[PDB]
Structure 1
Amino acid sequence: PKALIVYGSTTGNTEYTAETIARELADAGYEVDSRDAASVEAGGLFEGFDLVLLGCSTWGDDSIELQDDFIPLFDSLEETGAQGRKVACFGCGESSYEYFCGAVDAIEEKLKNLGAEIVQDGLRIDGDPRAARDDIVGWAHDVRGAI
């Protein structure tokens, strides 16, 4: 199968998470395309992929804002080919904020509304992802066994 992983990441934590997932899928025999959100165009982005994984960190002062490179993709998610696509979401944040990984909820909700098939509940990482590597790999295992 072919998997696409798209991530928005400003300090590297969601990027590190995306690459650890990519390695686990690649070792399972997938062909994986891992792209930063800053370099992609929404139109038709998911065409051809068996599985799409979207990851983003959460920002904003008092509100929920998505990571800046991911905003344009989020705003044009209806042109990506998400209807009927198997997807799953992930993201890093910090539990001291009101909306812990609130970008993950906003993306899952928009996908569900477009008719995507959410394969597993979102992976939500608190603090340093390097200290939660076991959770990331476990989650990557679960999504692969699901689709």
Structure 2
Amino acid sequence: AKALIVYGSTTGNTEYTAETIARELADAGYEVDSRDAASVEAGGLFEGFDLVLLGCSTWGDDCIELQDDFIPLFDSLEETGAQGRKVACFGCGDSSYEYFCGAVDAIEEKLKNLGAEIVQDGLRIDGDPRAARDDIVGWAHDVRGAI
């Protein structure tokens, strides 16, 4: 099975989360393509993957702001190949702000509006993801299991 993990990450927490997820999937035998959102183009990005995991941190005080590298992928998600695609989202955030991991809900609602098949409720990490390693690995285990 081939999986694509695409992450927007500014201070490296969602990137560390993606790497942990990539390792859990690769350990399970997936072929994993892990890409920073800054580097991708949306047109056709999900073509050929059996699973796509989108990871994105959240910013802003009074408006939910997605991580900036992710915003163009998000703005063009309708061109990514999501119809019928198995996907799940994850994101790092901080419960001391007003909208906890709001980027995760935003991306999930857009993938649903676009026909994606969300396979596990998103992983919303508060704080340093290095402290939520079991959650992250556990989540990756559940995603795989839900395929």
- Secondary structure in structure 2 of the residue aligned to 1:132: helix
Offset of 1:50 from its aligned partner? 0.2
Q: For 1:67 and 1:47, how far apart are their aligned partners in 2?
A: 23
Offset of 1:49 from its aligned partner? 0.2
TM-score (norm: length of structure 2): 0.98
Q: Which residue of 2 aligns with 1:109?
A: 109
Q: Deviations over 1:40-82 (max 9, x none)?
A: 0000000000000000000013110000000000000000000
- Secondary structure in structure 2 of the residue aligned to 1:64: strand
Structure 1: segments with no counterpart, 5+ residues: none
Q: For 1:117 and 1:18, how far apart are their aligned partners in 2?
A: 20
Q: For 1:75 and 1:131, how far apart are their aligned partners in 2?
A: 31
Offset of 1:98 from its aligned partner? 1.3
Q: For 1:63 and 1:44, how far apart are their aligned partners in 2?
A: 29
- Secondary structure in structure 1 of the residue aligned to 2:23: helix
TM-score (norm: length of structure 1): 0.98
Q: How many residue pairs get matched?
A: 146
Q: Deviations over 1:85-137 (max 9, x none)?
A: 00000000001111100000000000000010000000000000001101000
- Secondary structure in structure 1 of the residue aligned to 2:98: coil
Q: For 1:145 and 1:10, how far apart are their aligned partners in 2?
A: 30
Q: For 1:136 and 1:125, how far apart are their aligned partners in 2?
A: 8
Q: For 1:38 and 1:131, how far apart are their aligned partners in 2?
A: 26
Q: Which residue of 1 aligns with 2:81?
A: 81
- Secondary structure in structure 2 of the residue aligned to 1:5: strand
Contact 2:58 2:66 survives alignment (8 Å): yes
- Secondary structure in structure 2 of the residue aligned to 1:6: strand
Q: Which residue of 2 aligns with 1:24?
A: 24
Contact 2:61 2:97 survives alignment (8 Å): no
Contact 2:83 2:114 survives alignment (8 Å): yes
Q: For 1:63 and 1:76, how far apart are their aligned partners in 2?
A: 20
Contact 2:61 2:98 survives alignment (8 Å): no
Percent identical among aligned pairs is 99
- Secondary structure in structure 1 of the residue aligned to 2:63: coil
Structure 2: segments with no counterpart, 5+ residues: none
* Runs of 4 or more consecutive aligned structure 1 residues displaced over 6 Å after TM superposition: none
- Secondary structure in structure 1 of the residue aligned to 2:16: helix
Offset of 1:140 from its aligned partner? 0.5
